[PDB]
RNA sequence: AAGAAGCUAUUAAAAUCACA
RNA sequence: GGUUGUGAUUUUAAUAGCUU
């Protein structure tokens, strides 16, 4: 039991840091005052997906204007929007005012254009 | 007969959650939400009305 | 009468209007007079002075006090050394001929009609009725228009989340005024005047206009005190949500206008330090913006509270674990090296970085949260951090399984007639798709409060004695009693096992090394909120946090000792430990009766207790549990042990449903301590309202010299010193104890005060707790669910959703609880989930439901009777269908009797 | 006498309910 | 995947004790 729970905790620890985007992290931390960055503003300063569940169709339109979307001081581009059900929505429905229809927590799958 | 009814209700969801009618929202929170506000009802025949529009959506998938 | 006014409208141009001739108005007005006979802050009637309308504004008003012929000299001298600053209003001063002899007259010019402190103490001791001052200043601000008024609710703060816009509008006016009285002090100090600055010599318009008391000195040797000019404002000062004009950042962070570095700002010391300084440069407390500098546990309070008041202006991104990169198992990985908390400030992790080593940083936050990508949700006024690689994935509430022999045996029994007064009224209500998340939005109840710091240290020390019986301190490892197999051990250690493994896992010697190490750093931790199957009243969802394993294992090994004694001791005023049964309800119900004179009983209950939590006061009942670590640690390692716990229980990152959050504040049940610092929160609060009560008694009026000795006492230690004398605290300890008895049980308690006294407002009513929850707990406490039992033989109306009936035997009189009997049945129809195989759970269900329902055996109504029989009847049909511990009324009876 | 059960608690674990 | 507290009951086991 020992061996395997922390054998488990290394391996959960490992895959944290193969999925860290270490570099991302670095080039923004140490500029800070002693490379010290809340925990809570990290991903959206270095993280390259961006998710955002909106409300309903009012909230789609705030967040974006033209497929992109501006949040932590950067551009974000829309690639693929889900509804609840995690079916695909293509931008063509949510768009059109007919989403009244859809199902309204639409979840969208952003991403960072430099 | 509130309680007649009332009781009624939970199995309907039963059956229901055993479809997994979870799968779409819309139906679940449909129904869930006549669920719970018959649950609350005071009056018999409003209870008895949304017990009926329980009992046609769930005919509808069997 | 004209001639008078000619006077004053030579210069007025004559635009004014008397309110019923020359003669003085008849008004009550609110006041801070500390005096040798008076010393209070109620209201009180003072017809010395006339008051004009001026038709020019809308509501600008000229009033002239028409006395002290003797001390125009003193007022005019005074006017005019402080008349060249900006902060006071402008005075006129002449003599008037009446009958026999003149007297002098100062005019004030367009003074507005309620002084500063007319507000504060009506925002304070608010009430539904009789509010007609509180509506008048809010049209007269222009904060709403009189129709605003027609939502009868609409002073309710969680029915009407607009009421904290109205509100906000206030906050300009606050501002203003401390301003105006950082100029004033100024002035005073230069001019070279003494005194004392309280609300009633200040206007809305910001002005002050009342010098009578001050005293004349060298120039710039004045010294003025504003002790109790501040401090009675704080609740309002927080409430208003003033300094709002102040925030660092200006832009939204979705907005376009705005900047990816400016994130990373988290300091803030100099802007706060500036802050105070700006508007609090005459509060002569030295002001700490990191605590950890605090030298006294009372400092922390005074700091924090302050703290806690400029965090409005500060980001809410700014707080949260203070993470860095470092260079870990040869992967340089982001480590936790600090935590900025809300009110503590910014803390530093002591040591820088073996399973006792490495298995924190599979726990920390630090590592996963970098690791995922960015997540926005909408859904939730509270923040939202980031979401895991999978995705977001919502989970739903499946309804109980409904028990159809059990239904019709109560339909055989004749129970659900027609006849009304008795039906099911709890059912397993299910919940949408993703009810978590949604009930985690009504955190966003838990706006910030400040407390006022001068009157509730008083309070700290007085609560403070109520838990000086008990006994606490650190205790190793092995001495340490676990609930093994804990259910649960948060999100990032559930997967792999139950808490058990992880305790069998570490060794006793590794578990200690990892306390002394929580002894001198921060170690966050998540919380993975989560549902709860279970029955209710209500549509309502419930979810619970269950608090990671190193918390609890830490955090029991910090307050198990104290804890321990609080559920041994007996006969105390918290209750958390005692029984119901064997007659134990009696006895807590006879000695809560006890020693009162003229007792009725009262209750009540904190709505959305649990998110309302003003944060604040939680950590102030984190202090109290941990003061009892005199010996074994020293302060440093005290203050890092209560950081530690509001780092774990109050802003911990929160999962749920794959998205991660940062909970605003609020209490989290999953914690060891949540009844327990519940109930120092209620005693808190009970007591307040005591202090809040009593200082606005009429002293004047009074003729209980005790009562007046009292609170002369306790005025002159809130504002009028520095360190509370003890003498005073145990004499007031001892009077609350004797005409104002609490029962306390977690977050809910009974109260047996003395009518007399209370009717005097010498002792803390209803509507006491109804000002207090509102300028402290920022919640309305709806008169409904409160109540009030003028004859104590009858019980209390409810304790612990538990009636009490009185019964008479040749054991005597006794009081027996009796729940619900509809919860009961339902209780006996609904289950959770699919009964198991063996029906023998059944039993175990059905007889203790009878144990708790064997009480309606003696109630009066025919028809709850029925249902305890019918529940034995029912038992006894189950039991047959498969004796006399379940089978015999007597063995119910027994767990009834005495010993 | 052993032994045997019955009873009695104390301890431990599980299971289950009520309460916050 | 379904929390932590504090009571209570039932079973089970151990522990001794008592009685027959
Ligand atoms: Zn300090
Ligand atoms: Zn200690």
Known sequence: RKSKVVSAMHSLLFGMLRRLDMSSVDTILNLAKDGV???????????????????????????????????????????????????????????????????????????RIV | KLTDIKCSNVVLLGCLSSMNVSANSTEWAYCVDLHNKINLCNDPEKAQEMLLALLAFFLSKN | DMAY????????????????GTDTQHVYRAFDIYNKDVACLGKFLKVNCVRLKNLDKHDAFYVVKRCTKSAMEHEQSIYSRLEKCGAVAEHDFFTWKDGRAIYG?????????????????????????????????????????????????????????????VYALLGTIVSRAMLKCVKFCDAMVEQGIVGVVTLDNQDLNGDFYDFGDFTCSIKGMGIPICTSYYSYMMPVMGMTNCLASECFVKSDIFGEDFKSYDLLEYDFTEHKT??????????????????????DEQCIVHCANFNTLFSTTIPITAFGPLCRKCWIDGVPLVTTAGYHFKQLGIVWNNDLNSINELLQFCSDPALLIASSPALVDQR????????????????????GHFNKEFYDFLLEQGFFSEGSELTLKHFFFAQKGDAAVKDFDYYRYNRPTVLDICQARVVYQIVQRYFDIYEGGCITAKEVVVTNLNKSAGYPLNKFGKAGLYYESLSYEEQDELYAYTKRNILPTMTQLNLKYA????????????????????????????????????????????????????????????????????????????????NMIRMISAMILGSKHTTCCSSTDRFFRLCNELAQVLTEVVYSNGGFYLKPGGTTSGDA??????????????????????????????????????????????????????????????????????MILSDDGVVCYNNDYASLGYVADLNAFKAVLYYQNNVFMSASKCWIEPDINKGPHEFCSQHTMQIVDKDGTYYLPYPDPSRILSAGVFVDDVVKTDAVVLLERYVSLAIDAYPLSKHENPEYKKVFYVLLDWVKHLYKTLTAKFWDESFYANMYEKS
């Open chain 3, 274 to 295: 500036a802050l105070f300084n700006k508007y609090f440069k005459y509060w002569g407390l030295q002001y700490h913006p990191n605590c950890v500098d605090c030298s």
């Open chain 3, 380 to 399: 939730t006024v509270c923040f939202s951090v980031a979401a895991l690689g999978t995705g977001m994935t919502n989970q739903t509430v499946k309804p």
């Open chain 3, 535 to 614: 029955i209710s009243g209500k549509e309502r969802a419930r979810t619970v946090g269950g608090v990671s394993l190193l918390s609890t294992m830490t955090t029991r090994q910090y307050h198990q000792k104290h804890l321990k004694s609080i559920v041994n001791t007996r006969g105390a005023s918290v209750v958390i430990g005692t029984t119901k049964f064997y007659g134990g309800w009696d006895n807590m119900l006879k000695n809560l009766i006890d020693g009162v004179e003229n007792p009725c009983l009262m209750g009540w209950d904190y709505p959305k207790c649990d998110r309302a939590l003003p």
């Open chain 3, 105 to 165: 007259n100062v005019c004030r010019k367009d003074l507005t009609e309620y002084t500063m402190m007319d507000l504060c103490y009506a925002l304070r001791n608010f009430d539904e009725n009789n509010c007609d001052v509180l509506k008048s200043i809010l049209i007269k601000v222009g904060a709403c228009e009189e129709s605003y008024f027609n939502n009868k609710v609409w002073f309710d703060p969680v029915e009407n989340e607009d009421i904290h816009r």
């Open chain 3, 673 to 742: 301590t949540t009844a327990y610092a519940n109930s120092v929160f209620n005693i808190f609060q009970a007591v307040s309202a005591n202090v809040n009560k009593l200082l606005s008694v009429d002293s004047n009026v009074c003729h209980n010299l005790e009562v007046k000795q009292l609170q002369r006492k306790l005025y002159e230690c809130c504002y009028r010193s520095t360190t509370v004398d003890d003498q005073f605290v145990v004499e007031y300890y001892g009077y609350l104890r004797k005409h104002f008895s609490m």
């Open chain 1, 37 to 111: 960055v809340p925990l809570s503003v990290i991903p959206a300063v270095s993280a390259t997906k961006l998710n955002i569940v909106t409300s309903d169709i009012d909230s789609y339109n705030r967040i974006q204007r033209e497929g992109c979307v501006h949040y932590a001081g950067t551009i974000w581009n829309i690639i693929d929007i889900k509804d609840n059900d995690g079916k695909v929505v293509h931008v063509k429905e949510v768009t059109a005012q007919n989403a009244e229809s859809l199902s309204w927590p639409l979840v969208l799958g952003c991403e």
């Open chain 3, 5 to 20: 006014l000619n006077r004053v409208r030579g210069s007025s141009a004559a635009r004014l209007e008397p309110c019923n």
